Design an enzyme around this catalytic site. Structure first.
Site, PDB file in Angstrom:
ATOM      1  N   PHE A 108       0.066   1.686   3.031  1.00 17.83           N
ATOM      2  CA  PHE A 108      -0.105   2.117   2.147  1.00 17.83           C
ATOM      3  C   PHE A 108       1.610   3.324   2.823  1.00 17.83           C
ATOM      4  O   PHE A 108       1.269   4.311   3.662  1.00 17.83           O
ATOM      5  CB  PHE A 108      -0.730   2.414   1.518  1.00 17.83           C
ATOM      6  CG  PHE A 108      -0.975   3.180   0.614  1.00 17.83           C
ATOM      7  CD1 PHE A 108      -0.637   2.410  -0.855  1.00 17.83           C
ATOM      8  CD2 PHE A 108      -0.812   5.021  -0.154  1.00 17.83           C
ATOM      9  CE1 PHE A 108      -1.128   2.336  -2.220  1.00 17.83           C
ATOM     10  CE2 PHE A 108      -0.931   4.681  -1.172  1.00 17.83           C
ATOM     11  CZ  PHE A 108      -0.443   3.808  -1.914  1.00 17.83           C
ATOM     12  N   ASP A 120     -10.691  -3.838  -9.424  1.00 15.63           N
ATOM     13  CA  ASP A 120     -10.123  -2.645 -10.378  1.00 15.63           C
ATOM     14  C   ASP A 120     -10.533  -2.978 -11.582  1.00 15.63           C
ATOM     15  O   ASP A 120     -10.898  -2.508 -13.178  1.00 15.63           O
ATOM     16  CB  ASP A 120      -8.367  -1.809  -9.944  1.00 15.63           C
ATOM     17  CG  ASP A 120      -8.244  -1.320  -8.880  1.00 15.63           C
ATOM     18  OD1 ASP A 120      -9.685  -0.670  -8.599  1.00 15.63           O
ATOM     19  OD2 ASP A 120      -7.199  -1.469  -7.992  1.00 15.63           O
TER      20      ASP A 120
HETATM   21  N1  LIG Z   1     -13.080 -15.432  -6.096  1.00 20.56           N
HETATM   22  C1  LIG Z   1     -14.048 -14.995  -6.489  1.00 20.56           C
HETATM   23  N2  LIG Z   1     -13.835 -15.753  -8.351  1.00 20.56           N
HETATM   24  C2  LIG Z   1     -14.434 -15.014  -9.094  1.00 20.56           C
HETATM   25  N3  LIG Z   1     -14.751 -13.826  -9.676  1.00 20.56           N
HETATM   26  C3  LIG Z   1     -13.957 -13.524  -8.031  1.00 20.56           C
HETATM   27  C4  LIG Z   1     -13.785 -14.149  -7.474  1.00 20.56           C
HETATM   28  N4  LIG Z   1     -13.802 -12.573  -6.561  1.00 20.56           N
HETATM   29  C5  LIG Z   1     -14.049 -11.575  -7.183  1.00 20.56           C
HETATM   30  N5  LIG Z   1     -14.423 -11.776  -8.119  1.00 20.56           N
HETATM   31  C6  LIG Z   1     -14.745 -10.788  -9.252  1.00 20.56           C
HETATM   32  O1  LIG Z   1     -14.334  -9.593  -8.564  1.00 20.56           O
HETATM   33  C7  LIG Z   1     -15.380  -9.101  -8.653  1.00 20.56           C
HETATM   34  C8  LIG Z   1     -14.840  -8.052  -7.871  1.00 20.56           C
HETATM   35  O2  LIG Z   1     -13.934  -8.355  -6.490  1.00 20.56           O
HETATM   36  P1  LIG Z   1     -14.277  -7.245  -4.806  1.00 20.56           P
HETATM   37  O3  LIG Z   1     -13.492  -8.496  -4.088  1.00 20.56           O
HETATM   38  O4  LIG Z   1     -15.584  -7.778  -4.751  1.00 20.56           O
HETATM   39  O5  LIG Z   1     -13.588  -6.169  -4.794  1.00 20.56           O
HETATM   40  P2  LIG Z   1     -12.705  -5.575  -4.792  1.00 20.56           P
HETATM   41  O6  LIG Z   1     -10.746  -5.778  -5.280  1.00 20.56           O
HETATM   42  O7  LIG Z   1     -13.040  -3.677  -4.895  1.00 20.56           O
HETATM   43  O8  LIG Z   1     -12.766  -5.797  -2.876  1.00 20.56           O
HETATM   44  C9  LIG Z   1     -16.567  -9.993  -8.221  1.00 20.56           C
HETATM   45  O9  LIG Z   1     -17.782  -8.511  -8.137  1.00 20.56           O
HETATM   46  C10 LIG Z   1     -16.229 -10.791  -8.785  1.00 20.56           C
HETATM   47  O10 LIG Z   1     -17.356 -10.320 -10.452  1.00 20.56           O
HETATM   48  N1  LIG Z   2      -5.162   4.735  -1.481  1.00 21.24           N
HETATM   49  C1  LIG Z   2      -4.578   3.411  -0.755  1.00 21.24           C
HETATM   50  O1  LIG Z   2      -4.237   3.668   0.503  1.00 21.24           O
HETATM   51  C2  LIG Z   2      -4.424   2.404  -1.008  1.00 21.24           C
HETATM   52  N2  LIG Z   2      -4.390   0.557   0.127  1.00 21.24           N
HETATM   53  C3  LIG Z   2      -4.391  -0.131  -1.701  1.00 21.24           C
HETATM   54  N3  LIG Z   2      -3.897   0.432  -2.370  1.00 21.24           N
HETATM   55  C4  LIG Z   2      -4.254   0.230  -3.658  1.00 21.24           C
HETATM   56  O2  LIG Z   2      -5.072  -0.658  -4.320  1.00 21.24           O
HETATM   57  C5  LIG Z   2      -4.820  -1.672  -5.553  1.00 21.24           C
HETATM   58  C6  LIG Z   2      -5.457  -2.690  -5.278  1.00 21.24           C
HETATM   59  O3  LIG Z   2      -7.653  -2.866  -5.397  1.00 21.24           O
HETATM   60  C7  LIG Z   2      -3.588  -1.681  -5.237  1.00 21.24           C
HETATM   61  O4  LIG Z   2      -2.461  -2.152  -6.310  1.00 21.24           O
HETATM   62  C8  LIG Z   2      -2.895  -0.900  -3.794  1.00 21.24           C
HETATM   63  O5  LIG Z   2      -2.049  -0.274  -5.396  1.00 21.24           O
HETATM   64  C9  LIG Z   2      -3.979   1.960  -2.022  1.00 21.24           C
HETATM   65  O6  LIG Z   2      -4.952   3.028  -3.218  1.00 21.24           O
END
Ligand SMILES: Nc1ncnc2c1ncn2[C@@H]1O[C@H](COP(=O)(O)OP(=O)(O)O)[C@@H](O)[C@H]1O
Ligand SMILES: NC(=O)c1ncn([C@@H]2O[C@H](CO)[C@@H](O)[C@H]2O)c1O
Ligand SMILES: Nc1ncnc2c1ncn2[C@@H]1O[C@H](COP(=O)(O)OP(=O)(O)O)[C@@H](O)[C@H]1O
Ligand SMILES: NC(=O)c1ncn([C@@H]2O[C@H](CO)[C@@H](O)[C@H]2O)c1O
Ligand code: NA
Ligand code: NA
Lengths: 311, 320
Positions: free
Chosen positions: A116, A252
């Site tokens: 980042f 997000d």
């Molecule tokens: N392979 C997938 N298939 C369907 N839905 C997904 C998949 N990956 C993520 N999602 C949806 O997006 C949500 C957030 O994904 P996650 O990977 O846990 O979050 P983060 O992006 O913060 O790591 C999950 O709880 C699910 O509802």
């Molecule tokens: N703040 C951090 O260290 C950071 N690392 C990744 N990101 C954002 O995290 C989002 C993914 O969930 C992307 O769009 C990135 O811009 C962040 O804000």
């Protein structure tokens, strides 16, 4: 309105069409070597506040991003906010500064390893959540450290309900600051990996965290999510993705759906399901904001996935 | 002259100051999440052919890079080759094309996850290794797949001894093309992770691979390396690094030293130790090519590490 505090950034995302888990060899000296061919770099609109606001706006909610950009290269993002109808009221553009940039190396399981370049995000504290007006709900996502803490304190002092979403900013917190943030927060949202890091850094169990918020929301990728309270838990199923292209930004998108459900008085089962659907819509497209369903399409897909309509 | 076939690229290296092993949580759905601060993006001179040739050039060898660059952004690399005395004879520049770009995330254990945008590297097979003149020794390293395979065929048919270094190019191979390449190769050089993948893909044991080459060289990071040949196996020690800044390119620095030792008729013990020394001098600086020891410094550090002066033998040296 809903105040969305967090990073506003340009992302360079390199998604491995595979799973790093299938390439680790713990018995060798080198755990992992992997080179994978990618297409031409596309700078994407990103940042956690950008992404969450984009999702809440897709749903028709009133998303007020609060974050800092850099004047050198902010203009494409400001023009996009105006095109999308996203208010720039609390988007501060800092002269002679570069916007944050994320270089994200990841896989189909959302194993994001990000380098980042913070730029303007380091001065995010110049925006004070306490200066925003008519906010009924907020989220405090990854950002400059001082800004994250200051937003949490100012929202708590006003009594505005807010999700604390430390995410990628977790390393910036020590135990005492992390504990205080959770005491102040109305809800905490994390993925399962981050949830383990929060328990380790605070020393609290998940039960103890749930005793200090209205909801501890833990997302679990393809397995859905859990919403934990002091007196029970909702299991939220994943929606089957049309295709699995890029999970960057899934959490997000999920947070924007959750925020919409909380604002509209959905119960947790329904707010969680809307969130889950937004995550599944996002993953079918490369980049955090590339998916672009209409509100009608989202409503139809919710009925198809879940067999009812929200309320 | 030693022909160095491989990628020529600009590297963006993102150094995680830690070890990925300390951050993997297999019981979670997300195995690993990291987000770490980095400074302003700076492109470093890289690519396997650039790195290996840079090492051979530091040793005073005559390294002839064979690879493709893109005209849009080739000039800094062309100018650097001129400044260093690296011949551009076999460096082809493609019009209206970008050069290869690697986005590399490293840890301190020398783990790398790289997103690679091939650009001009996609056309590397436009150069033909069997046509290069008065080459006494070569290496074929990671590159466009068609180029890698073509170079191996052509060098073997021209009877030029060459190291085969499939390296990061391994995913592009199947078992049949990989077995064929090893049959043709004079030597194979790999790190241990890659060595495991080669055994898996070929269906061969290390024993079986070793029977099809003159030497099988496997590097093991800070643990040094092994060189398996006809009469025995050399256990090559690591040289203690003055500091660990960036492991990217350590294997390429090693291969430069190995190529210099083979050319000059060093014994395997000595060629290996020179290679090992170059790996250690490299890791003390950021980027695959920013280490710039003088040739006298290399000899002095070899003496300090190993207790003797690195020398070869005319009788065992290579001729064209
Ligand atoms: N392979 C997938 N298939 C369907 N839905 C997904 C998949 N990956 C993520 N999602 C949806 O997006 C949500 C957030 O994904 P996650 O990977 O846990 O979050 P983060 O992006 O913060 O790591 C999950 O709880 C699910 O509802
Ligand atoms: N703040 C951090 O260290 C950071 N690392 C990744 N990101 C954002 O995290 C989002 C993914 O969930 C992307 O769009 C990135 O811009 C962040 O804000
Ligand atoms: N931490 C270190 N300290 C000293 N020497 C090292 C270190 N890491 C690598 N080297 C030297 O560089 C060589 C190649 O490193 P290695 O990580 O095996 O290759 P690669 O860059 O191909 O993955 C080693 O065999 C060793 O001689
Ligand atoms: N061909 C590939 O997939 C590849 N991946 C990384 N590299 C280069 O590998 C070198 C390190 O050995 C770096 O300088 C990179 O440019 C490559 O050539
Ligand atoms: Na709380
Ligand atoms: Na052979």
């Amino acid at each position: 309105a809903t105040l969305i505090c967090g990073s506003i950034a340009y992302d360079n995302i390199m998604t491995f069409e595979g799973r790093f888990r299938e390439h680790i060899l713990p018995d060798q000296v080198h755990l992992i070597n992997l080179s994978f061919l990618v297409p031409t770099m596309r700078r994407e609109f990103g940042g956690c506040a950008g992404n969450i606001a984009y999702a809440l706006n897709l749903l028709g909610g009133d998303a007020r991003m609060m974050g800092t950009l850099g004047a050198v290269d902010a203009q494409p993002y400001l023009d996009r906010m105006d095109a999308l109808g996203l208010s720039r009221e609390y988007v501060r553009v800092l002269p002679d500064t570069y916007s944050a940039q994320a270089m994200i190396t990841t896989d189909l399981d959302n194993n994001q390893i990000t380098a980042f370049h913070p730029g303007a995000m380091m001065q995010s504290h110049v925006n004070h959540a306490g200066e925003a007006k008519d906010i009924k709900l907020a989220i405090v996502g990854p950002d400059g450290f001082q800004g994250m803490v200051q937003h949490t304190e100012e929202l708590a002092q006003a009594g505005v309900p807010f999700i604390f979403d430390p995410g990628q900013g977790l390393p910036l917190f020590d135990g005492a600051t992390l504990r205080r943030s959770i005491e102040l927060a109305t809800y905490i949202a994390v993925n399962d990996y981050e949830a383990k890091l929060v328990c380790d850094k605070t020393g609290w169990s998940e039960d103890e965290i749930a005793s200090r918020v209205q909801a501890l929301i833990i997302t679990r990728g393809e397995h859905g999510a859990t919403i934990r309270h002091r007196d029970g838990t909702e299991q939220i199923p994943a929606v089957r993705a049309e295709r699995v292209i890029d999970p960057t930004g899934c959490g997000d998108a999920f947070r924007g759906g959750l925020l919409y459900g909380i604002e509209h008085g959905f119960d947790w089962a329904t707010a969680g399901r809307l969130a889950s659907l937004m995550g599944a819509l996002k993953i079918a497209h490369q980049g955090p904001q590339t998916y672009a369903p209409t509100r009608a399409e989202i409503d139809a897909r919710f009925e198809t996935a879940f067999g009812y309509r929200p309320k």
